[PDB]
Design a protein around this motif. Structure first.
Motif, PDB file in Angstrom:
ATOM      1  N   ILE A 203      -1.353   1.689  -5.603  1.00 36.36           N
ATOM      2  CA  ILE A 203      -1.885   0.563  -4.943  1.00 36.36           C
ATOM      3  C   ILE A 203      -2.664   0.999  -3.707  1.00 36.36           C
ATOM      4  O   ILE A 203      -2.184   1.756  -2.862  1.00 36.36           O
TER       5      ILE A 203
ATOM      6  N   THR B 219       0.803  -1.178   0.000  1.00 33.87           N
ATOM      7  CA  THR B 219       0.000   0.000   0.000  1.00 33.87           C
ATOM      8  C   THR B 219       0.862   1.264   0.000  1.00 33.87           C
ATOM      9  O   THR B 219       0.383   2.365  -0.282  1.00 33.87           O
ATOM     10  N   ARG B 220       2.151   1.117   0.311  1.00 32.76           N
ATOM     11  CA  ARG B 220       3.021   2.289   0.332  1.00 32.76           C
ATOM     12  C   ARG B 220       3.299   2.792  -1.056  1.00 32.76           C
ATOM     13  O   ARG B 220       3.858   3.887  -1.235  1.00 32.76           O
ATOM     14  N   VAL B 221       2.875   1.916  -2.000  1.00 30.56           N
ATOM     15  CA  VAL B 221       2.970   2.033  -3.446  1.00 30.56           C
ATOM     16  C   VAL B 221       1.913   2.890  -4.087  1.00 30.56           C
ATOM     17  O   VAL B 221       0.769   2.462  -4.290  1.00 30.56           O
ATOM     18  N   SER B 222       2.357   4.089  -4.416  1.00 33.92           N
ATOM     19  CA  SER B 222       1.583   5.139  -5.030  1.00 33.92           C
ATOM     20  C   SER B 222       0.645   4.724  -6.156  1.00 33.92           C
ATOM     21  O   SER B 222       0.662   5.313  -7.200  1.00 33.92           O
TER      22      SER B 222
HETATM   23 CA   LIG Z   1      -0.472   3.408  -1.499  1.00 34.92          CA
END
Ligand SMILES: [Ca+2]
Ligand SMILES: [Ca+2]
Length: 327
Positions: free
Chosen positions: A98, A93-96
DNA sequence: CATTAGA
DNA sequence: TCTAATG
């Protein structure tokens, strides 16, 4: 603020998980009012039961409350903290690009790692791609010192295309922040306002400008009022390149700047407070307009604004430099 | 709370 | 069309 912190944080941690790791909107929505109420209470809750007296606090939240209390820990909390699957989810979720559904998805797909994500770049959409592409640079902070150069440039091109352009670098920056997590441009033009049925290009012009010039370098998301991307500072006479930054440009109708303008710059509490006051001061404020109340309960009719001052002039306040807009 | 993507 | 992710 500290006499019931543990109960709240324990609780958010409890909410947050149901949210993401599980589809428990409700339970998740659960830990949240509770974690909010107990957040308020003036006294140290010394027991579940005590706690349970509260609103939103059924048998459930109380139970964990006692365990938290007795023992410096919690099982559920200890187990998740341990839960790789669920860990994975927090991670991805740290994935811009996602969000919860995705992360849960790759996770079932077996992609839990950053690397795992690389191996399958295909599975990721454009966003998730860039996101994957500037992960390191997404997480870092934007020294005002950079905000500094960054702002300049952008004001630089905007004036260029058209001289009738008004933009502002809204947010914490605007408010002095020794650092900012991303740049935010609030833009308007006289020929754009509430009615005068657009001019997307009004947006589009600058977009292309900042581009032609290199500062922009990618596109996360383009619309005719809300651009959302990535930018970079011209890496000097070498040896020191800049990192990759998120950035967002947004078109607004001349007739609703100052609010929106006032409005983003926060702070979160400065907004609410100046806002509450406006209620007393017989007004209605919101991201785009200010409206004068009418005893009937509510009223309509957006007052005419010209700059931050007008909002202020109205509710009869002290003009506040963004400087001291902290609260 | 609204916008955009994308399927 | 709706669902998702960002602000
Ligand atoms: Ca994210
Ligand atoms: Ca109750």
């Amino acid at each position: 603020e500290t006499l019931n912190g543990g109960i709240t944080d324990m609780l958010t941690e409890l909410a947050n998980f149901e949210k993401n790791v599980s589809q428990a909107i409700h339970k998740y929505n659960a830990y949240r009012k509770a974690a909010s109420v107990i957040a308020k209470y003036p006294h140290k809750i010394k027991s579940g039961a005590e706690a349970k007296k509260l609103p939103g606090v059924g048998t459930k939240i109380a139970e964990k409350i006692d365990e938290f209390l007795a023992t410096g820990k919690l099982r559920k909390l200890e187990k998740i903290r341990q839960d790789d699957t669920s860990s994975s989810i927090n991670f991805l979720t740290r994935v811009s690009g996602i969000g919860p559904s995705a992360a849960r998805k790759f996770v079932d797909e077996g992609i839990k790692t950053l690397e795992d994500l690389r191996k399958n770049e295909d599975k990721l959409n454009h966003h998730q791609r860039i996101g994957l592409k500037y992960f390191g640079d997404f997480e870092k902070r934007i020294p005002r010192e950079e905000m500094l150069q960054m702002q300049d440039i952008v004001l630089n091109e905007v004036k260029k295309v058209d001289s009738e352009y008004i933009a502002t670098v809204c947010g914490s920056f605007r408010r002095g922040a020794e650092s900012s997590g991303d740049m935010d441009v609030l833009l308007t033009h006289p020929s754009f306002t509430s009615e005068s049925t657009k001019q997307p290009k009004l947006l589009h012009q600058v977009v292309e400008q900042l581009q032609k010039v290199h500062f922009i370098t990618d596109t996360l998301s383009k619309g005719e009022t809300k651009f959302m991307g990535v930018c970079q500072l011209p890496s000097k006479n070498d040896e020191k390149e800049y990192p990759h930054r998120r950035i967002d440009i947004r078109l607004i109708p001349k007739d609703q700047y100052y609010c929106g303008v006032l409005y983003f710059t926060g702070s979160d509490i400065f907004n609410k407070n100046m806002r509450a006051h406006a209620l007393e001061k017989g007004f209605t404020i919101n991201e785009y307009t200010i409206r004068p109340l009418g005893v009937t309960g509510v009223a309509g009719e957006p007052l005419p604004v010209d700059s931050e001052k007008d909002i202020f002039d109205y509710i009869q306040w002290k003009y506040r430099e963004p400087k001291d807009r902290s609260e």
